[PDB]
């Protein structure tokens, strides 16, 4: 079945790094490279913070500061934060794109960083 399976919330601290661990899912028979995509408040700002398809469309905030941790082909989408931010609080949602096969997670990772 289609899905992305990570924390709901996490905490982390100014300056400091967090790693979301993330896992996702797609039928077996969907034919499959995969496009990764993560976006930081995707119902309102929606900046792009991950894109594996072209780096060039990530917002200059995470620039040098995002990278995607897991291997796509083995279904791992974990995302390292580095050099945290009060304001990199909110909401991050992992987005895959296959081929119609495309898949946004709704629910998403929710960050709060704190001094
Ligand atoms: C396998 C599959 O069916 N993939 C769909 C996906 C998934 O259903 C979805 O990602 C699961 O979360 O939906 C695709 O279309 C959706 C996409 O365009 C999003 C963009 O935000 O909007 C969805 O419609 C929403 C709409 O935006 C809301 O205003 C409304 O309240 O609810 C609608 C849903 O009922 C689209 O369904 C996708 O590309 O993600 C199409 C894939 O084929």
Same mark, same amino acid.
């Given at each position: 079945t289609w899905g992305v399976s990570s924390p709901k919330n996490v905490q982390g601290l100014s300056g400091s790094c967090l790693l979301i661990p993330c896992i996702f899912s797609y039928p077996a028979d969907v034919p499959v490279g995969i496009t990764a995509i993560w976006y930081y408040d995707y119902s309102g700002?929606?900046?792009?913070?991950?894109?594996?398809? *072209?780096? @060039?469309?990530? =917002?200059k905030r995470f620039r040098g500061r995002?990278?995607?941790?897991?291997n796509m082909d083995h279904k791992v989408c974990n995302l390292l934060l580095k *050099?945290? @931010?009060?304001? =990199?609080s909110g909401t991050y949602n992992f987005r895959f794109e296959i081929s119609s096969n495309r898949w946004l997670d709704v629910k998403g990772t929710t960050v709060t960083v704190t001094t």
């Open positions: 700002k929606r900046q792009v913070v991950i894109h594996s398809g *072209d780096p @060039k469309l990530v =917002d995002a990278e995607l941790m897991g *050099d945290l @931010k009060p304001e =990199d």
